[PDB]
Amino acid sequence: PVDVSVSIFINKIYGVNTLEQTYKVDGYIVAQWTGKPRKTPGDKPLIVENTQIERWINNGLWVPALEFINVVGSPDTGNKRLMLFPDGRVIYNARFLGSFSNDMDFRLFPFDRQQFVLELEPFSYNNQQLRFSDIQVYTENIDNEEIDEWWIRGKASTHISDIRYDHLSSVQPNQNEFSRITVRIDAVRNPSYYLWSFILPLGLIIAASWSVFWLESFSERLQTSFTLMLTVVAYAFYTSNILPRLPYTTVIDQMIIAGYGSIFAAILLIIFAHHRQANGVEDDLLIQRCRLAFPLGFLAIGCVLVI
Amino acid sequence: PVDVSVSIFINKIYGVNTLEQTYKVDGYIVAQWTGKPRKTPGDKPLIVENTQIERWINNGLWVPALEFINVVGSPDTGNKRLMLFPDGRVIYNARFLGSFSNDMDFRLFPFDRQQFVLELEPFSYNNQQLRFSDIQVYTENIDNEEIDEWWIRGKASTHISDIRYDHLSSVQPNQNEFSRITVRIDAVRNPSYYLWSFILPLGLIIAASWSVFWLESFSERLQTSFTLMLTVVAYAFYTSNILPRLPYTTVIDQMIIAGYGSIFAAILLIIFAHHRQANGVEDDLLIQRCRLAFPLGFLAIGCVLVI
Amino acid sequence: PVDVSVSIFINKIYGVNTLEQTYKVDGYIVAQWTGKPRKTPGDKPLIVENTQIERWINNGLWVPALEFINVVGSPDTGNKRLMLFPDGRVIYNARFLGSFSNDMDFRLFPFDRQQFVLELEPFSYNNQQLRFSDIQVYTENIDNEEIDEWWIRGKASTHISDIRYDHLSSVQPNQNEFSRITVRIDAVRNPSYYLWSFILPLGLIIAASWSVFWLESFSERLQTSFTLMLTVVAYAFYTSNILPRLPYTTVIDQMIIAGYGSIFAAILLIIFAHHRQANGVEDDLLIQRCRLAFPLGFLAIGCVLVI
Amino acid sequence: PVDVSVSIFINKIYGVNTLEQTYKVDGYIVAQWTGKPRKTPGDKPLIVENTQIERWINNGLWVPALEFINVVGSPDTGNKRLMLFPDGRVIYNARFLGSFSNDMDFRLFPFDRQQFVLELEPFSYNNQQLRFSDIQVYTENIDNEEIDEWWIRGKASTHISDIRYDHLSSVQPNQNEFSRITVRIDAVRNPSYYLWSFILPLGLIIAASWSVFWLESFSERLQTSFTLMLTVVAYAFYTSNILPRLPYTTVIDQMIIAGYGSIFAAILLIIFAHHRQANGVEDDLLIQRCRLAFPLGFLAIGCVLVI
Amino acid sequence: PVDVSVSIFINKIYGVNTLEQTYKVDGYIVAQWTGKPRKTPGDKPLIVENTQIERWINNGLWVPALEFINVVGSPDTGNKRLMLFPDGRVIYNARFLGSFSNDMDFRLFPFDRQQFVLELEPFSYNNQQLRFSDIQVYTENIDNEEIDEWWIRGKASTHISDIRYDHLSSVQPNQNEFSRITVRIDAVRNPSYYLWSFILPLGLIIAASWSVFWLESFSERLQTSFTLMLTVVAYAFYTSNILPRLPYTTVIDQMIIAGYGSIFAAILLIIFAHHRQANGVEDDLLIQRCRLAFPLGFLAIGCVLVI
Ligand SMILES: CC(=O)OCC[N+](C)(C)C
Ligand SMILES: CC(=O)OCC[N+](C)(C)C
Ligand SMILES: CC(=O)OCC[N+](C)(C)C
Ligand SMILES: CC(=O)OCC[N+](C)(C)C
Ligand SMILES: CC(=O)OCC[N+](C)(C)C
């Protein structure tokens, strides 16, 4: 089995797509292995760029195809080069930009943590092995972060392993395992923007909704309720059109639903107070003054959104 | 006729497009057939990757083109390889990502079920036949699902058949049938998000609209109606800009229309009560108090949205 | 002049773009012509796929380039094949997906009818002629239609003709005409969704706007007017963001404008009634009760939106 | 210097992008020049299509590369052909679709006029010259225009000239000028849609805002103002989300700002009237009745939006 | 080491993407170096365009690959040419359009300044060196700017340097440095549109919100507050849907939040005044008349948004 060592340089992780559970990675891949020594002009190692590589392959040079297992679509590869040493070293180097897939749980939004992973297997050869993996994510830890969407826990962790393909015929009858490199990079979301521009105002609006009980008239209370209703709707719209699309509810989504519920409960009480009596317009004294029952009865059912 | 057996590995089904009735599929395809025995270096089977395959084809190697019948646009193929055994086996393997078409009925939205299908025929050869089909959809059944938009029934069903092309001249005068593989994967939509973030609040807002009848003044009742009207409009906007585009109405779309209707009927009654009398401001006693006629007269016409 | 007969199979028409006046078509093209008889392995006709075709062309095979006149950008062609008969028949077959252009009048929206056309000319040869055209639009007529956005009149009509290029130098000094095939498919839009989800509610909202005249106070009437105003704006927004972009007004656009007009006229009257008198608050009796003048004076100016 | 004459056929101008100041053009380019006479099969001129052209170039055929100076990105070229006459004429013909750039001033929106230009220079040869330019924009003038977004002044103007590249080393030490063709097509925007669907209603809404002064109470006047405020905001949103993005204000943008200003001035007056007196609720008689001061004081400051 | 001098002509900088921190650049690159003298037809330098270049490379011509370090994805290259002088000069020239990345701080929005940078390194050769850099950004300084989104300081600055790659094996054991050209162009954003169309109206709206304190009734003051609330929400939506997406708050974003806060504080006061007394409806005289406390207490906390 040929020993292949790869180093992966990661230049940029960007463009997360919540719906597709993908993210873009720009970087270089280097792969090295040793073969039969070779005669090279002078006795300096030889450099072969781009279109020239295929020529060498036609005349017999072995350059194994390494696949990104979890890439979605053919990656965009830029320049590639072979460095051919006379003593038989062969070093493959290429620039790449790809869309990579992973399981991504966005349920604890603004405060979610994800891992960006790369998975590398040789495409055709079970009979050749990854000797070691080195990722150089030489961005940086504590620096520009409040300029960036994602904060890296860093540096990346690696794992060479063996994957069994049971339904894939192979060269020999016994050997059906592939060598796989797996790189993982952990990251937390920069929750600032969403706290200050979404969660805060949502709170303010929800709170202010409670000030309905400090209105004197029943007519005033009920009528104003419908305007608070409209406000939550506008806010849900705003919230939904600007936040990332998902197939499930986030914490912000729940707050919105709570807002709706509070305002509906209010409309129930407000109407109840006015007709739970013994005359016509005897608003239930104590009740119409649950100007403290709601706010904290909601901060109770609001501390069970975190259980 | 040459016997070709194919296995399809499905990695990912994503990116449904409701308007185009398409969906994206990432996977591998493997196709095997036996030909004339061959001399191979050593006597180990031979591996041929990517650009090298065309070379073998020019020197006479037969590699039939298999077409995805229901793909929309040329699929993006990654690496491909031929594995050439000395005893004449030939195995073709390629990575692919394509947009596939199928008839898709989204009428019973949030609760719709679809089938993602693949259809494979040889492009030029009627005179070669699919021996068997195996799909390995080794994602998984009951696991991550609430993380995913679609839930798979699984595993996929297969079916080799013969398709007659009556208006397509062929090699011989009699033979105009093509061998076709058809893969089907069933799936139900994860209805959670839409229940809690759309259907529920729509309900609340529709209900609350009913509380118009508990207002004392006619002036209060009619004027408030126009605000409920605006609310349903905002809600329709929100609902439309965020839900999948379709050429027909979904259940949610109907709820919205009901909301509009209820609010219009109300404005009719409210105005009727005020002028069906014998004076000037004698609001029809019994009627203005259909605070229960509407809510259940609507839950009646609301159980005929399901007949 | 060489006789070429072409058949066009149409798999899918989709993705209309109103602004660009384009639409996408997926299908196969087949083109047949006879040349000098040929020696073929065995004496069976010979099949040549994809990359192999250019090889045959380099060695002298004539394969005329047929251009889609009204395609916008290079079409995406999938597999292509030549079938070479020993008696000299040559059949070219290719899968294609392309964006096609045509004049498209969307003025009578939801109820518009369009024709999807293809136009085929040889690219370089005036000196070769289309013998006949067959389109197999074997979708189907009355079937799935309420699942589809467009309903086909069907089947397609065809048209071979000759086009004169006066400013294009040609092989000989006299001959400057090209053989053109033109396929036409008629289609009507599925107007359901827009009737029930846009036109209907617009109507309700417009009607409800009229109920402003059944308000007792002048203050009540004028103030409520501004809310109806806001409602039409919200509705216009909703309508515009969701309906297809056009450089002109559709029927729905006009309804919206009417809505605006009605509500402005009402604000004029409402203010007039209050100051066309002889005191201070003597609302012109008869006028403030044009609760029937408007509704039908609008259904009059609403039956001149169709003259 | 070789004399090259080019004709450009323009099929379609579409897809203007206001932000990028680009537009799409689909057409054919033809370029003709004479070289050394040649032996051709028969003695008929010879036709060479697509992949075959490169072959001729390898064997020595000269085909100069003509660059679209103001294209943004590599244009999409369809079929291309060489027509080789035995007397040495050589005619190059290719289909093209490209994104072209020009300075574009959208300041006088709905009523802006633009020019769509093409600029052609040889890529490498200063030492070869454009003899003449003919554009065949055989669309048409007064015909379908209300179906189209842009109206062409027509026909296009042309202008061969010489461009000096001072910082570009050339074949000889003296010669650093390139032959450039420049095509210009003038066009005016079809202002209908924007007049009837944006400018008109904006007017109505602005006018109606003035009817605030015909309200009896101060409370009524101030409170209603805030609703007019909200309306202008909704309208700005609607206007912005639907109109073309620009880095500057259009006339419509200014109207919107005026609307905002009028409504703010009103709020100032309304509050002033109520407290510029000598008691408590003595609304300044004359002032509260500037129901004509505003409307025309605005049509004054509204005729200085056009100075 | 081979001396390579490059000139970069910049035609267009456009398409900034705030989320990705990228921008598009269209231009030409020219690279020159001297090699072994050569026999050329006549003794005029020789021009080699496009596909022909690879041919010369197969026959031994050395054309080093220059990589844009900070491009994102393979740039779109148009025409390329080699100019081969007989005395051994070699000049490579290519048109390019690429998406480039840089650190981009948009925190001080409408008034941010950015630098558009290019970074060039040889892809494989450490053993070859950039002798000098010239950028010809011959757009222009003070001219069309109010037509353009970005205003260039100009002209660009350059800087050849040496970059150490510690984890990249090289030709010789010692030499692991690459020659890198860095071009920088400074630019300020055209803040007009955002001042007049966003910041201004936001101000007006915020100010008008203060006029709530000039309402007579408590009921009037509280109820009107909820409409001002809704207005800020609509405005936030409008602002968010139209302004560039970012992972952090801009100045505009902060104004919005202030608006929310002012309105909430008002609701607190308004309710406080009404219940900080000694009866039932004794609105705290002095307080309810903080019609000047707020406006300047906000212009105070509004001059600490700039500390
Ligand atoms: C299932 C299958 O086709 O795998 C091929 C690619 N490989 C071995 C790298 C995963
Ligand atoms: C209609 C037509 O061209 O079919 C050719 C390809 N085939 C037989 C695989 C569908
Ligand atoms: C105008 C022009 O160049 O037309 C050539 C292609 N043709 C004849 C198929 C339309
Ligand atoms: C600056 C530069 O590279 O120009 C080359 C192309 N030309 C001469 C057609 C503009
Ligand atoms: C890290 C790496 O792969 O660099 C290769 C390209 N280079 C040397 C020009 C930066």
Ligand 5 pocket by Cβ (under 6 Å):
A 9, 28, 30, 93; E 67, 121, 123, 165, 168, 178
Asked if E172 and E72 sit in the same domain, the reply is yes
Asked if D178 and D83 sit in the same domain, the reply is yes
The three-state secondary structure class of A205 is helix
Residue A28 lies in domain: 1-190
Q: Which residue of B has its CA nearest to C214?
A: B271
Structure tokens at C28: 């196969």
Structure tokens at C109: 């929206």
The three-state secondary structure class of A125 is coil
Asked if E18 and E95 sit in the same domain, the reply is yes
Ligand nearest to the CA of B127: 2
Measured in angstroms, how far is the CA atom of residue D123 from the centroid of ligand 4? 6
Q: Does E168 touch chain A (CB under 8 A)?
A: yes
H-helix or E-strand spanning residue B301: none
For residues A200 and A191, what is the distance between their CA atoms, to the nearest angstrom?
12
Q: Are A25 and A13 in contact (CB under 8 A)?
A: yes
Cβ partners under 8 Å of residue B184, min gap 6: B115, B116, B117, B156, B157, B158, B159
- Assess whether the C-beta atom of C32 lies below 6 angstroms from ligand 2: no
Q: Which chains touch C (3 or more CB pairs under 8 A)?
A: B, D
For E216-280, the three-class secondary structure string (H helix, E strand, C coil) is CCHHHHHHHHHHHHHHHHHHHHHHHHHCCCCCCCCHHHHHHHHHHHHHHHHHHHHHHHHHCCCCC
Measured CA distances, B129 to B31, B64, B163, D254, E93 (Å): 12, 11, 12, 70, 53
For residues E91 and E6, what is the distance between their CA atoms, to the nearest angstrom?
9
Instruction: Write the burial class of residue C41 (CB in 10 Å: 0-12 exposed, 13-18 middle, 19+ buried).
Output: exposed
Q: Are D102 and D70 in contact (CB under 8 A)?
A: yes
Measured CA distances, C283 to A123, C267, C268 (Å): 86, 14, 14
> Between the CA atoms of A138, A142, A148 and A149, what dihedral angle is there, to the nearest 10 degrees?
100
From chain A, pick out residues whose CB is under 8 angstroms from the CB of B144. Answer: 103
Instruction: Write the burial class of residue A74 (CB in 10 Å: 0-12 exposed, 13-18 middle, 19+ buried).
Output: middle
Cβ partners under 8 Å of residue A280, min gap 6: none
For residues C212 and A108, what is the distance between their CA atoms, to the nearest angstrom?
48
Chain centroid to Cα E108, Å, comes to 12
The DSSP code for E213 is G
Chain centroid to Cα B294, Å, comes to 37
Query: Rg (Cα) of chain D, in Å, rounded?
Result: 30
**Residue in C197, C206, C219, C256 to test binding to B, most B beta-carbons within 10 Å:** C197
Q: Are B275 and B132 in contact (CB under 8 A)?
A: no
User: Does a cis peptide bond (omega within 30 degrees of 0) precede residue C44?
Assistant: no
Beta bridge partners of A185: A116
Nearest to A246 by CA among A152, A107, A144: A107
For residues D66 and D104, what is the distance between their CA atoms, to the nearest angstrom?
25
Asked if B125 and B75 sit in the same domain, the reply is yes
Measured in angstroms, how far is the CA atom of residue C53 from the centroid of ligand 2? 17
Nearest to C69 by CA among C156, C134, C165: C165
Structure tokens at C158: 């065809």
Structure tokens at D282: 């003595």
Q: At what angle do helices D218-242 and E200-210 cross, to 10 degrees?
A: 160
Structure tokens at B44: 């180990």
For residues B255 and B236, what is the distance between their CA atoms, to the nearest angstrom?
10
From chain E, pick out residues whose CB is under 8 angstroms from the CB of A200. Answer: 257, 260
Measured CA distances, E37 to C219, D174, E41, E43 (Å): 95, 22, 13, 11
Q: Are D27 and D8 in contact (CB under 8 A)?
A: yes
- What CATH number did the domain enclosing B25 receive? 2.70.170.10
With tokens 């920088």, the residue in question is: E184
Q: Are D113 and D135 in contact (CB under 8 A)?
A: no
Q: What is the largest CA-CA distance in chain B?
A: 110
Structure tokens at E82: 């080699």
The DSSP code for A259 is H
Q: Are C246 and D193 in contact (CB under 8 A)?
A: yes
Which residue, judged by its Cα, is nearest atom 4 of ligand 1? B28
For residues A96 and A10, what is the distance between their CA atoms, to the nearest angstrom?
10
For C87-117, the three-class secondary structure string (H helix, E strand, C coil) is CCEEEEEEEEEEEEECCCCCCCCCCCEEEEE
Residue where a domain stops, chosen among B174, B190, B206: B190
Start-to-end CA span in chain A (Å): 53
Asked if B111 and B224 sit in the same domain, the reply is no
Phi, psi of D192, rounded to the nearest 5 degrees: -55, -70
How far apart are the CA of D142 and the nearest CA of chain E, in angstroms?
Answer: 31
Q: Are C119 and C180 in contact (CB under 8 A)?
A: yes
Measured CA distances, E16 to A188, E13, E106, E188 (Å): 26, 8, 11, 13
Asked if B156 and B101 sit in the same domain, the reply is yes
Helices (H), chain B: 51-58, 192-194, 200-210, 218-242, 251-275, 285-288, 293-300
Mutate to test the pocket of ligand 3, among D50, D91, D93, D136 (most ligand atoms within 8 A of CB): D93
For residues B18 and B108, what is the distance between their CA atoms, to the nearest angstrom?
13
- Strands B157-164, C46-49: pairing is unpaired
Say if the Cβ atoms of B193 and A229 lie within 8 Å. Answer: no
Structure tokens at B174: 């009699």
The three-state secondary structure class of E200 is helix
Beta bridge partners of B135: B8
Q: Are E242 and A239 in contact (CB under 8 A)?
A: no
- Assess whether the C-beta atom of C30 lies below 6 angstroms from ligand 2: yes
What resolution (Å)? 2.9
Which residue, judged by its Cα, is nearest atom 2 of ligand 4? E28
Phi, psi of E108, rounded to the nearest 5 degrees: -85, 55
For residues A170 and B200, what is the distance between their CA atoms, to the nearest angstrom?
54
Beta bridge partners of A116: A185
Phi, psi of E92, rounded to the nearest 5 degrees: -95, 135
Asked if B204 and B92 sit in the same domain, the reply is no
Measured CA distances, B31 to A172, B74, C175, D249, E124 (Å): 18, 19, 51, 61, 39
Nearest to C63 by CA among C76, C75, C52: C52
Structure tokens at C117: 């056309």
The neighbour count for residue E66, using CB atoms within 10 Å, is: 19
Phi, psi of A13, rounded to the nearest 5 degrees: -120, 120
In this structure, which amino acid lies at residue A94?
A
Nearest to D220 by CA among A259, C23, C218: C218
Q: Are B256 and B235 in contact (CB under 8 A)?
A: yes
Label residue D254 left, alpha or beta by phi (over 0 means left) and psi (-120 to 50 means alpha).
alpha
From chain A, pick out residues whose CB is under 8 angstroms from the CB of E65. Answer: 49-50, 79, 81
Q: Does B227 touch chain A (CB under 8 A)?
A: yes
For residues C149 and C192, what is the distance between their CA atoms, to the nearest angstrom?
10
Measured CA distances, E12 to B99, C111, D103, D183, E181 (Å): 35, 44, 11, 20, 19
Give the method used: X-ray
Which residue, judged by its Cα, is nearest atom 5 of ligand 3? C123
Asked if D96 and D240 sit in the same domain, the reply is no
Q: Which of residues 235-274 of A touch B (CB under 8 A)?
A: 236-237, 240-241, 246-249, 253, 256-257, 260-261, 264, 267, 271, 274
- Assess whether the C-beta atom of B26 lies below 6 angstroms from ligand 2: no
Beta bridge partners of A68: A120
Nearest to E19 by CA among E182, E243, E187, E254: E243
Q: Does C87 touch chain B (CB under 8 A)?
A: no
How far apart are the CA of D123 and the nearest CA of chain C, in angstroms?
Answer: 23
The three-state secondary structure class of C78 is strand
Cβ partners under 8 Å of residue D246, min gap 6: D18, D19, D106, D109, E193
With tokens 């053109």, the residue in question is: C180
Q: Are A224 and A212 in contact (CB under 8 A)?
A: yes
Measured in angstroms, how far is the CA atom of residue C32 from the centroid of ligand 3? 22
Asked if E178 and E216 sit in the same domain, the reply is no
The three-state secondary structure class of E304 is coil
Closest by Cβ to B229, choosing from C14, C134, C205: C205
The three-state secondary structure class of C307 is coil
Label residue C50 left, alpha or beta by phi (over 0 means left) and psi (-120 to 50 means alpha).
left
Cβ partners under 8 Å of residue C75, min gap 6: C68, C96, C97, C98, C99
From chain B, pick out residues whose CB is under 8 angstroms from the CB of C193. Answer: 246-249, 253
In this structure, which amino acid lies at residue A24?
K
For residues A279 and A263, what is the distance between their CA atoms, to the nearest angstrom?
27
How far apart are the CA of A306 and the nearest CA of chain E, in angstroms?
Answer: 25
For residues D93 and E92, what is the distance between their CA atoms, to the nearest angstrom?
27
Dump the DSSP string for A46-87. Answer: EEEETHHHHHHHHTT---PPEEETTBSS--EEEEEEEEE-TT
With tokens 């222009």, the residue in question is: E140
Asked if C163 and C41 sit in the same domain, the reply is yes
Nearest to B247 by CA among C15, E284, D34: C15
For C175-243, the three-class secondary structure string (H helix, E strand, C coil) is CCEEEEEEEEEEEEECCHHHHHHHHHHHHHHHHHHHHHHHCCCHHHHHHHHHHHHHHHHHHHHHHHHHC
The neighbour count for residue E8, using CB atoms within 10 Å, is: 22
- What CATH number did the domain enclosing C224 receive? 1.20.58.390
- Assess whether the C-beta atom of D65 lies below 6 angstroms from ligand 4: no
Q: Does E55 touch chain D (CB under 8 A)?
A: yes
- Give buried/exposed letters for B254-273 (b at 16+ CB in 10 A, else e): ebbbbbbbbbbebbebbbeb
Measured CA distances, C105 to C183, C240, D139 (Å): 19, 18, 17
Say if the Cβ atoms of A264 and B197 lie within 8 Å. Answer: no
For residues B149 and B24, what is the distance between their CA atoms, to the nearest angstrom?
14
For residues D290 and B296, what is the distance between their CA atoms, to the nearest angstrom?
52
The DSSP code for C71 is B
- Give buried/exposed letters for C111-133 (b at 16+ CB in 10 A, else e): ebebebbbbbbbbbbbbbbbeeb
H helix and E strand count, chain E:
7, 11
For residues B82 and B85, what is the distance between their CA atoms, to the nearest angstrom?
10
The neighbour count for residue B218, using CB atoms within 10 Å, is: 19
Residue where a domain stops, chosen among E190, E209, E238: E190
Query: Rg (Cα) of chain B, in Å, rounded?
Result: 30
Residue where a domain stops, chosen among E141, E165, E190: E190
Q: Are A139 and A151 in contact (CB under 8 A)?
A: no
Q: Are C264 and C255 in contact (CB under 8 A)?
A: no
Measured in angstroms, how far is the CA atom of residue D122 from the centroid of ligand 4? 8
Asked if A154 and A266 sit in the same domain, the reply is no
- Give buried/exposed letters for D174-196 (b at 16+ CB in 10 A, else e): eebebbbbbbbbbbebbeebbeb
Nearest to C101 by CA among D145, D26, B99: D26
The neighbour count for residue D278, using CB atoms within 10 Å, is: 5
The neighbour count for residue B96, using CB atoms within 10 Å, is: 20
From chain B, pick out residues whose CB is under 8 angstroms from the CB of C90. Answer: none
CB pairs under 8 A between C and D: 137
Closest by Cβ to C193, choosing from B167, B248, B274: B248
Give me the number of domains chain A comprises.
2
Structure tokens at B185: 């994967």
Q: Does E112 touch chain A (CB under 8 A)?
A: no
H-helix or E-strand spanning residue B112: none
Start-to-end CA span in chain E (Å): 53
Cβ partners under 8 Å of residue E301, min gap 6: E258
Q: Does A60 touch chain B (CB under 8 A)?
A: no
Structure tokens at A66: 């390494």
Asked if A230 and A271 sit in the same domain, the reply is yes
For residues E119 and E193, what is the distance between their CA atoms, to the nearest angstrom?
32
For residues C255 and C241, what is the distance between their CA atoms, to the nearest angstrom?
16
The three-state secondary structure class of E302 is coil
The three-state secondary structure class of B156 is coil
Which residue, judged by its Cα, is nearest atom 2 of ligand 2? C28
- Strands E2-17, E128-136: pairing is parallel
Cβ partners under 8 Å of residue D7, min gap 6: C167, D29, D30, D133, D134, D135, D136
For residues C230 and B226, what is the distance between their CA atoms, to the nearest angstrom?
10
Cβ partners under 8 Å of residue C279, min gap 6: none
